[model samples]
Target: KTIVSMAVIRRLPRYHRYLEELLKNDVKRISSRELSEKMGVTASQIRQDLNNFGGFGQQGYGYNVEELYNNLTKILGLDKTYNTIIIGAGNLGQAIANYTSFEKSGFNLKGIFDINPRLFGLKIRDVEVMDVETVEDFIARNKIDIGILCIPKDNAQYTADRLVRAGIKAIWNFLPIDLKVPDDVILENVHLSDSLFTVSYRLNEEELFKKLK
Candidate 1:
């Protein structure tokens, strides 16, 4: 695999999303020069990044909108669907269950797990909540690839460990605690506002702190 620059990698998705919107608007044949004008990069840079895979533009036709969009989906691992499971059934957990962002992004919420039996079989945003005890079984049966942790701080590490053991490849951690994972696993900590208190001396408000990154 080609090692892509962080700057290039970060902008790839943004560009792909814009292209998708352009596709929705029935736009076609985007030139690297035109893309560069909108994205604040050089036309040669855009061509070089796309060239990392293969030369996509025709001599006079520019880059084909549909083909480029499809190529980007494959390049970013969004061509196929990814299975996801959320752990914890509290208010925050249920809120995650209700969130449609993952679905819109092409990730399927295979199930939501919680310790409470009362919450099980209950529907949240058309997804039935499952008992935490069945998490491993559901993961194995459904081949879940991603785990979302919405549990309390005390249970965060334990839940992460359980997820790792259950064959979770990627994690979206909403827990307020730091977690240790195997070198091969991907862990993305969605840190809380209050957790940044140490950096509070430099920041003004929570929104500024969150938006800074």
Candidate 2:
């Protein structure tokens, strides 16, 4: 497997989603130009991005929608089952636990953990919340592949450390803190506020455009 840039990796989901839609619509083939227009990217950029993973598009024939979709799903590792655990069963954690879509995409949410006793034994989307105290043992026994951090910023690192030590290979951090895990461990930090601010800035740009006009 070629190690592609993060930029390319990020775009894989977009490609997969678009391809899925195309398949649903009975669209068997698509040219880079068509995809580029739909995705608001350039045709050459789309081709270049797909080329990172051995471009499947044939010259003049475009790409077979189903074939490309299957390739992308495999490339994204959606074909494999991932045993995942969500920590900090607070509102955000519960929301994530309630998100059933991950299961369809090969993420098996085995359990949710929280330090709060009040949340213990509570079922979020049929998965009972487990006490954080037993999380280390639970992860070890279950062979958890993914750890989701929805805890407070101050508690993030401590929980992450515990998860790492308990043999978690990947972390999906929703906390504001930047965690330092081992080189072998994968981390995807989700800064919701940062993304919101980006949208806010674009709206500000719209106002600036009206003012200039």
Candidate 3:
């Protein structure tokens, strides 16, 4: 397989989501054109995206839903369970912990941590919130695979550094600031506000189109 671009990799989740919906409806097969319309992309683009991984579409029969869904799931590493810990057990952290869908997606929430005393020992979604002071020790002991940061911007880098030093291989950051990590460490920074702002711009553009017409 060729080195897949991040753009293509990012779209995997969207594909997975669509395929999951198809499975729920008992749809057994799909054509590139049908999927393209559902995904808001051209049929050729859909074909190219699948071809990058491995073509799933058979010219006449199209693609098998089960086979394609399983393939995309495996490709996205959703087939393997990853032990994950959430740092900062604040509102955002607790919310993430409560999201049980992560478990279904192959991410096991092993622990949740916070610096505050009142939050410590509290159970968020059945996972006790540990003290951040013991984060490194906890990671060393639990063989954690993913570190989720939902802390303040000022503390994000510090928390990330500690996680990295403790042998965390991947980080899912939700802070406002950008982080610096070792080249070997996998980092996925999520900025909810950025997406909101992008949509705001699109809304304004739509108004502009209406005004022009």
Candidate 4:
């Protein structure tokens, strides 16, 4: 597969979301300009992004909403289901475990594991939290596809290594540290602190800009 820019890749899911809504609303086809107005993505950029995938829509007749949605489903690999596990049964992990929408999208939560014994055996949304020690065994037996890490910073890399050794191909990491996983492993870090820090900076950004004037 050709490499698309990270930004362009990120925007594809949002396009899928909007197109899904369009399909629900009985929108059979939509023009680039029309989609740009609704999605706030410039018309040309939308076309350019689609072009990365060999251009799904037409020049004049517009995009078939249903067809585009299905294309994105296959493009994003949402067409197939993923067996996922949540590590760390902490607040964040439990919250993610309880998130039903994740399962609705084919990311089936198989188990939740925690380092703390207190969390072990407890169920979040009916999926029992297992002992952290059992993570590798569970992955090996369950054919798990994705590992969801909500563990502490210190344990992040160590636990990730175990996941890698257990044959987990992808990781949805929420720990603050930048993990060094193998090249073949797909790592997605959701650093909440960094995101919030950026929000704080943006809040003060406008104020500082005005003061410097």
In order, the Cα lDDT scores of the candidates are 0.83, 0.90, 0.89, 0.90
**Model 3 ranges off by over 4 Å:** 210-213
- Residue by residue across 31-62, what tens digits does model 3's lDDT show? 88888888897888777878888869698877
Per-residue alpha-carbon lDDT of candidate 2 for residues 1-213, written as tens digits (9 for 90 to 100): 237888888888999999999999999999988888889878887788888878698989799999999999998999999999999887898888878888999999999998888888997776899889999999999999999998889878988999999999999999878899998999999978877999888979988899899
- Give residue 167's error in model 3 in angstroms: 0.2
TM-score (C-alpha) between model 1 and the true structure: 0.76
Model 1 root-mean-square deviation = 5.6
- Backbone Cα, N, C clashes tallied per candidate: 0, 0, 0, 0
TM-score, predicted candidate 2 vs. hidden true structure: 0.94
Cα error, residue 208 of model 2, in Å, equals 3.6
Error of 4 at 181 (Å): 0.9
Over 4 Å off, model 2: 207-213
Show the colliding residue pairs in model 4: none
Clashing residue pairs in candidate 1 are none
Candidate 4 minimal-lDDT segment of 10 residues: 1-10
Q: How close is candidate 3 to the true structure, as a TM-score?
A: 0.94
Model 3 lDDT, full chain set: 0.89
Per-residue C-alpha lDDT of model 1 across residues 65-153, encoded as one tens digit per residue: 98999899899898679899989878988888777876877898888898888887888766788888878788888999999998888
Scored by Cα lDDT, where does model 1 land? 0.83
Error of 3 at 5 (Å): 0.5
Please tell me which model should have the higher TM-score, number 2 or number 4: 2
